[PDB]
């Protein structure tokens with residue numbers, strides 16, 4: 019087809035897979051027809067095992083059919099390993115002077131080249147602080163509320179070393195969102211930093227943590243706090259007895275505790291991390307990832323989707339508060355001994371050339387970013403890109419949202435000067451790593467398509483009418499019909515909800531996305547089919563936004579829908595009703611918007627607020643009829659469907675008239 023972009027010749031010669039699509043298809047076919055042998059070989063080849071699984075022909079067991087019993091998957095049962103050991107110790111001392119992170123702060127005067135040897139020292143130091151000053155034991159939960167600095171990777175790996183369970187809270191979340199996650203995870207310890215900065219704006223991490231910790235204590239929790247010195251100590255307060263500066267904890271270490279810390283050898287299905295993730299229903303829930311399968315899957319996808327070789331220099335722009343930073347900043351890259359760029363700042367400070375200054379300075383060859391960022395760079399204009407030397411780039415990656423042809427072409431042919439392959443990687447928190455993706459050198463690309471499934475992955479298109487598999491070119495519900503090593507194993511404390519959310523169609527993992535498969539077998543992701551939003555690349559649920567809106571004292575109820583937004587991809591549209599007698603003013607609407615930002619964070623800011631004067635559209639039971647609100651927010655006033663269940667049909671006329679006025 020004419021929209022196909024061939025892989026570059028040079029990448030084809032370098033590829034771990036081969037120079038032609040036939041090479042990929044040969045491996046893919048093997049990974050399905052001989053699935054256990056495939057993963058056994060990869061696992062043995064590329065990872066360290068203290069103990070291996072007993073049988074190469076049965077490295078997985080599973081059930082995807084609720085009628086046969088509980089849903090479950092297990093990978094490498096019987097094997098024993100450690101993620102920190104694979105990320106760090108095993109590379110030493112051979113690679114002690116190899117750079118692990120080229121770190122730069124938000125402030126371009128702040129830089130450090132952190133070697134693998136230095137990471138080892140930093141990690142054994144912190145692990146010993148955790149074990150012997152905080153008494154952190156295997157299985158204990160530790161919360162992280164950190165900026166993108168070396169200490170963030172150190173903290174993740176130190177917890178893995180001792181078998182603690184991390185839960186990472188994105189630094190953009192508010193105190194209330196942080197507290198909620200610490201409460202649900204029952205963290206014994208919060209690791210944070212004094213402060214960071216986003217361009218010109220200070221980010222007062224410990225000050226926010228103080229409010230979250232006060233809220234947790236008022237509910238009876240006792241959470242200690244360890245604070246890294248990222249700035250000058252003078253942005254935050256410290257509570258005697260609860261809060262410790264990391265430098266003070268370091269000083270208490272014995273000399274030996276700077277050189278060695280025992281490794282906790284983990285069983286395959288021991289929990290590695292909990293990641294709170296927005297869903298179609300209810301508040302964010304903790305997705306559970308275990309040890310052996312996730313380790314293998316995050317690392318193997320990193321290697322093949324980006325074709326990482328030891329002479330490559332890798333830069334992913336994601337934060338550790340989201341799954342992309344787990345799999346594709348810290349765990350996967352370090353397990354394959356990558357040299358990476360670690361960047362605390364933002365793409366527009368000091369100006370929109372910053373990421374390209376990083377690419378040139380560190381000779382980056384693989385850049386993994388997101389369409390929201392790409393759209394913002396495009397809007398800033400090509401001259402911010404072209405002042406940078408991009409000759410070293412050979413692979414560009416995109417994650418988290420659909421990317422249109424114009425942005426894809428701009429990424430490759432302006433950003434990458436037309437000498438790069440592009441890996442548009444589709445996957446989710448629940449899948450651990452990439453699921454549908456190009457591979458450099460061997461995969462013809464279609465701009466806008468994720469292309470072909472990763473090795474071992476069997477996607478299907480389910481018919482939205484009767485929910486069976488569709489053959490041939492087809493559009494419908496995206497599902498996965500067989501297990502893969504990186505699959506999340508449960509929702510923390512609520513396996514019933516896990517089965518209900520993802521396994522409602524027996525035999526399939528239901529993604530929540532829709533997709534079209536074309537006549538070449540390439541997949542085109544068309545977005546969520548449930549109520550989940552994708553706002554500036556952040557996955558957010560309508561329920562926490564509505565719950566946040568409803569905490570404003572004047573608000574009776576609300577309903578949130580998404581709408582197309584040029585920069586954010588999807589914006590947040592709020593319909594809401596106020597108590598009888600409320601004076602509706604611009605200041606009131608501003609206070610409701612600020613309430614959402616207080617309860618959740620800036621990432622959930624409403625873009626439009628429409629006052630439903632008579633009420634939200636609702637059935638006799640009280641159920642808000644959301645399709646009505648969806649159609650209105652788009653201007654489509656004739657395609658609403660049926661309203662006969664509306665206890666208050668008077669509401670409709672008001673909703674269309676108001677929208678025409680606001681003109682979103």
Ligand SMILES: CCOP(=O)(O)OC[C@H]1O[C@@H](n2cnc3c(N)ncnc32)[C@H](O)[C@@H]1O
Nearest residue numbers: 417418419420443444445446447543546557
């Ligand atoms: C890794 C982030 O994982 P999550 O934060 O859990 O968001 C997962 C959700 O992002 C969306 N998505 C992710 N990658 C793509 C892509 N390449 N093209 C289109 N849409 C994408 C999709 O809707 C999915 O279900």
